[PDB]
Design a protein around this ligand. Structure first.
Ligand SMILES: Nc1nc2c(ncn2[C@@H]2O[C@@H]3COP(=O)(O)O[C@H]3[C@H]2O)c(=O)[nH]1
Length: 138
């Protein structure tokens, strides 16, 4: 019970903003999914399904998105802003709009392998693990 509201589902819920997707949002989600090295083999219907279940998440500078060693619950596409990747406390890259992340824990069914921080204010499209894994499990 002490652990019920710790974890990605609780954290991301706190960053959710209800939003109608605009044409440019749909377009960018589709191109970004064609660009993830796990989703590059998805067909257009699989992409459309993922896109339908994407939600909008808003972050301020220095907010944590993913923490290395935790259970993963989401796959993300960067919509705006800059997100840094840290592997064992060393920053390995900075990602911007169109990049995606969070697939590895979900595919391998393992802990998050890096920490991702909003370096600037930024926004993400995120889909829950259930939909993501189901789309790949075929
Ligand atoms: N481990 C690792 N993850 C990275 C790297 N660059 C981007 N990532 C992403 O950071 C994510 C952290 O959560 P996941 O392990 O689910 O998936 C990881 C990748 O999508 C990298 O160089 N190493």
């Amino acid at each position: 019970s002490n652990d019920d509201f710790t974890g990605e589902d609780s954290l991301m819920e706190d960053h959710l903003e209800l939003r109608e997707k605009l044409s440019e949002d749909i377009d960018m989600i589709k191109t970004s999914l064609k660009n993830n090295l796990v989703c590059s083999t998805l067909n257009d219907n699989e992409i459309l399904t993922l896109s339908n279940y994407m939600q909008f998440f808003v972050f301020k500078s220095g907010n944590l998105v993913i923490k290395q060693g935790e259970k993963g619950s989401y796959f993300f596409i960067i919509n705006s802003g800059k997100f840094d990747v840290y592997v064992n406390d060393k920053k390995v890259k900075t990602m911007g709009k169109g990049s995606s992340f969070g697939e590895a824990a979900l595919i391998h069914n393992t802990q998050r392998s890096a920490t991702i921080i909003a370096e600037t204010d930024g926004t993400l499209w995120g889909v829950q693990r259930s939909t993501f894994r189901a789309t790949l499990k075929q």
